[PDB]
Write a protein that binds this ligand. Structure first.
Ligand code: HEM
Ligand code: HEM
Ligand code: HEM
Ligand code: HEM
Lengths: 141, 146, 146, 141
């Protein structure tokens, strides 16, 4: 459930990403829409074309929710409370999509941080995303 | 699996440039490291006590090349993955009884290895072409469960 | 899908005894109730505010019979589920974009509905024969994702 | 994350099952071995034939772990601690198998309690099993 080593590996990863967070968050979404088309129906009103300002603005929102999650890693349930309510209750986002997006988030980092994406760090991040996804799907009505 | 001409181009292109002696052990190694439960099928490989011990293990690298040989071959026959992977499916399903879902994890770890190695070159659209391939192969390898 | 003679017997047997006017709405209804996110594809059915409201909904029962008609048909053509479900796959995959994995949930909810209704009769071995069928149909309905 | 209604529905279900718990736990395992063969490799030394005393004895062990989980529903992580360690660390039981077994546990109840297995109760139980499975897979080394 996120060992100390994982928290360290994730925190280190966050640091390297630095300000590129939003940009990389927008990239992971684009990657998901292209790789897993069915996820797109959750964004009918969004323009998902490359360079979309909406996808850009939204990738920044995702990035800030992940940073808030790490900044409060020991208690994500409480921190990600409003978002679990949002994704499960209102959006009705099925659980599988969180797996799809997490993978893209991991693929996005591997593609921007060859040095930090070691096997250990890859494993920690996967556990981090898995933990965040578990919270985001704890509120199914 | 049916890749459009542009999707085929994107996959053949990057794939021609893959170091077949390393990518395979890298994806197999990360799988063992990222999804620990998969080590249950490799008690014979030796020291898998640490990520470095897993990544540096000779048997892992040796076996990863085979797995990779399996993908290169899959790519060579996309319009017919079933017949191609028939034999590996009997082994993985009927003899090994590899937990359902493991084949997709490895494909996805493969995809992560491809991104790490190529970086910018592994564009969102390039990745999309590979998720199809990985899904075609994982589905085919699991035909004995169909 | 390939069912052995005994597996075919176990499925045809119980299936002949299924009330085609109720089992379908029951499995579809429970799906909407057990996996709430699936209601996103039925905003047009009306009141799905409560389990009783979902279970008693007319459109659910009406649509459940169709789904059921789809399974009966699947059973009628096991040795060839792909060609049989081709059209429903284009609809569910290309038009609807039904989240991957939903087809297996419903099969599994179907299985739960079968057990509830038949009880003792739905023996472990009888259930095993149906998990194959459900898996053959879910796989076939997802051929557009292959 | 298990509403009050779910706890009530699960507790009610537990009551109806009464002493048949062990028997039904052994039945769910048998159902899993037959329906999902790959799960069998986790029990190489077990005789999985029908009426196996080992499957019988083990189904009783599973049933007691689920009852302990409900008897301590508000804090399953701590209660299922030793079991998470056992299944993840030692056994290396892959996550998908918990889904396979939960389904069989649900199919087993539906087949023995037509009255209590209403749509609502089915949903609650599924969430209960999902919650227990989440704990059993929180300790992956
Ligand atoms: C780790 C994964 C994820 C995180 C951290 C996350 C984060 C966010 C955030 C912070 C918002 C902004 C909500 C607001 O404005 O208050 C949001 C909304 C939303 N999310 Fe996610 N999300 C994730 C995964 C998903 C997935 C997997 C889907 C579906 C494939 C999804 C679909 C949506 C949609 C459709 C909205 C509303 C967008 C709009 O209409 O403006 N999310 N998400
Ligand atoms: C989709 C990815 C996979 C591909 C393409 C693949 C490919 C291969 C190949 C080419 C072989 C050697 C076959 C031979 O020697 O005849 C093999 C063997 C084996 N694979 Fe995989 N494999 C895959 C996934 C997995 C997974 C997920 C596991 C389970 C953790 C697994 C476990 C094994 C084992 C234990 C062997 C050794 C068999 C032996 O030498 O007796 N494989 N695989
Ligand atoms: C494996 C189980 C499934 C089977 C066999 C099945 C079967 C059917 C059938 C026979 C139809 C009517 C087709 C027609 O009118 O031409 C249909 C329509 C539909 N299905 Fe499914 N279905 C399955 C799973 C799902 C799932 C999981 C969802 C998503 C929640 C879904 C969503 C829909 C919707 C929204 C329609 C309405 C289409 C329309 O009338 O325009 N189906 N299905
Ligand atoms: C809700 C689900 C489950 C519960 C509550 C559970 C409970 C238990 C309990 C209480 C034991 C006894 C351990 C001891 O003796 O201290 C055990 C052991 C074990 N479990 Fe599970 N388990 C579950 C699911 C699984 C699954 C899904 C698998 C694999 C398919 C699995 C494989 C095993 C194995 C192989 C053992 C050791 C048996 C032996 O060698 O004697 N368990 N489990």
């Amino acid at each position: 459930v996120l060992s100390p080593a994982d928290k360290t590996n994730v925190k280190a990863a966050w640091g390297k990403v630095g300000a590129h967070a939003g940009e990389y968050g927008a990239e992971a979404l684009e990657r998901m829409f292209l790789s897993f088309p069915t996820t797109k129906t959750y964004f009918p009103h969004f323009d998902l074309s490359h360079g979309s300002a909406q996808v850009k603005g939204h990738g920044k929102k995702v990035a800030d929710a992940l940073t808030n999650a790490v900044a409060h890693v020991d208690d994500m349930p409480n921190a990600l409370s409003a978002l679990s309510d949002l994704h499960a209750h209102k959006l009705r986002v099925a659980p599988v999509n969180f797996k799809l997006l997490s993978h893209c988030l991991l693929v996005t980092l591997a593609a921007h941080l060859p040095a930090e994406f070691t096997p250990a760090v890859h494993a920690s991040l996967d556990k981090f995303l898995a933990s965040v996804s578990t919270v985001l799907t704890s509120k199914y009505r | 699996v049916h890749l459009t001409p542009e999707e085929k181009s994107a996959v053949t292109a990057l794939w021609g440039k893959v170091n077949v002696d390393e990518v395979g052990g890298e994806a197999l190694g990360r799988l063992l490291v990222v999804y620990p439960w998969t080590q249950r099928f490799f008690e014979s490989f030796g020291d898998l006590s640490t990520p470095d011990a897993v990544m540096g293990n000779p048997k892992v690298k040796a076996h990863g090349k085979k797995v990779l040989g399996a993908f290169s071959d899959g790519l060579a026959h996309l319009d017919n993955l079933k017949g191609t992977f028939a034999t590996l499916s009997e082994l993985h399903c009927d003899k090994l009884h590899v937990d359902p879902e493991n084949f997709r994890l490895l494909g996805n770890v493969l995809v992560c290895v491809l991104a790490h190695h190529f970086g910018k070159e592994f564009t969102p659209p390039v990745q999309a072409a590979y998720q199809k391939v990985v899904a075609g192969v994982a589905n085919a390898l699991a035909h004995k469960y169909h």
